[PDB]
Scaffold this active site. Sequence first.
Site, PDB file in Angstrom:
ATOM      1  N   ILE A 202       0.845  -1.188   0.000  1.00 29.97           N
ATOM      2  CA  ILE A 202       0.000   0.000   0.000  1.00 29.97           C
ATOM      3  C   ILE A 202       0.882   1.240   0.000  1.00 29.97           C
ATOM      4  O   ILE A 202       2.016   1.222   0.489  1.00 29.97           O
ATOM      5  CB  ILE A 202      -0.957   0.029   1.215  1.00 29.97           C
ATOM      6  CG1 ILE A 202      -1.776  -1.263   1.304  1.00 29.97           C
ATOM      7  CG2 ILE A 202      -1.889   1.229   1.133  1.00 29.97           C
ATOM      8  CD1 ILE A 202      -1.993  -1.742   2.722  1.00 29.97           C
ATOM      9  N   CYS A 203       0.347   2.323  -0.556  1.00 34.40           N
ATOM     10  CA  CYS A 203       0.972   3.639  -0.511  1.00 34.40           C
ATOM     11  C   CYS A 203       0.101   4.546   0.347  1.00 34.40           C
ATOM     12  O   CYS A 203      -1.096   4.697   0.079  1.00 34.40           O
ATOM     13  CB  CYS A 203       1.135   4.223  -1.914  1.00 34.40           C
ATOM     14  SG  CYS A 203       2.431   3.447  -2.901  1.00 34.40           S
TER      15      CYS A 203
END
Lengths: 65, 146, 143, 71, 76
Positions: free
Chosen positions: B83-84
């Site tokens: 995830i970012c």
Amino acid sequence: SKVPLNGFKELSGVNGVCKFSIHRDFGSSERLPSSHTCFNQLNLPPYESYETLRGSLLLAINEGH
Amino acid sequence: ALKRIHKELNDLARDPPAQCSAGPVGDDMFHWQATIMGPNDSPYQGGVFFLTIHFPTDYPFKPPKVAFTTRIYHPNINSNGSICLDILRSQWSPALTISKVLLSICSLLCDPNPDDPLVPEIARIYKTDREKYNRIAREWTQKYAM
Amino acid sequence: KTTFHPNRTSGINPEHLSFFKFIGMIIGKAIRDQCFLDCHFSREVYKNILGRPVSLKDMESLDPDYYKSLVWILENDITDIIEETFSVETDDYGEHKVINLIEGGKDIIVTEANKQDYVKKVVEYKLQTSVKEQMDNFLVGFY
Amino acid sequence: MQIFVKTLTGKTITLEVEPSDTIENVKAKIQDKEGIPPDQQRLIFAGKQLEDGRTLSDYNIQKESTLHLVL
Amino acid sequence: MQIFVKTLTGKTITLEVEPSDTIENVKAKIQDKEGIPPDQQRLIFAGKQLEDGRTLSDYNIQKESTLHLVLRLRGG
């Protein structure tokens, strides 16, 4: 700015070992190349000419600092 | 630092603001499993996504590690589950809590961010091919959310 | 990962002081020999070898995010969120241990009235006291 | 701290030293106590000869450490 | 049963041991994987150094136990 001890095969990210990756970007060619350091990811637009790509990459890396 | 984790667990089990259910696993308070419901008015509606959380020993001085165990179709969510998220990368503060990051994840699911995508293909599809993005998200939700 | 800092637990091997001194002399010879080394040291090592005092600025290099949390505790707010005391809990090869930053540090609770000294003691212990003997041997070997 | 030096047939002598003290200082103290010049003193610890240019901490010498003197 | 051996920051390895075997057997089994001779490997558990003569039963070793491996600093 430091390469891994062993070399570029030892590249590591947040989740561990992660080699440098380049991903095509279909956005406007004027878009500056983008990067995500969390996974050594580089989203690059398909620049038609080498000079334009060099200029865009120089601008990106210089603006990074 | 275990006291802070216990407080977060008590808060989540008491009044979890986000539409999620998370808790420790394997009798370890540093390893957590969470479930995020599919927000309405979105192709993910009706789907539940499973996430794995690793709490650093220096919590809350260090951001928690979040990964998407359930396969999802999102420009900002990696296929492998990475995830970012700024709050977990550079903007992390001790004041932040597990519930806050869960709410941020739920929002990000509600409003994608094509401007900073981890998968340019999905970002472009969502931006210019909304019908394809909705269809593919619905199929992925049906296949890997239930 | 490229840069390293001296290990606190080096005491497990009785000869660690001598090996730190040997590392110092070999680094000095490398500087004399003009042979660049890909190895790097945390800002604390450079500051100490140059004689400059070590502070939270060195702590930034070692623990960037954790240093951010420390500075946020010190200035950005009034903390009072964690029940941390003036002690550090460590796991030395499976043995859980607690080290008191100050006398009676285990019981005293960290508060806004004692956070300014708490952070200073924490950074001093992390950077200098925890490595006092090893870094002194390294320095005498280098010089 | 203090260390002990023992000969093959003689008694054991006590020397007050510190980790920074070099083996040359140890030999000088031995000469002061007994008069033997450093060149005539050979120091062994753990079966390894001790060099003048090094110190006690180099060879892992600690308090109450026992050394063998051979002339 | 099986036991785990871990370095300070490197990977972790698994050995198939039993309580009666001496630490010599554990060191030898470590050697086959990494190649460190037993004379150089230092094995620790619960913060206490181990000895070749004793065995797992002596150190009350049990299942899913994690030991710590270090490389010897020979003095000379």
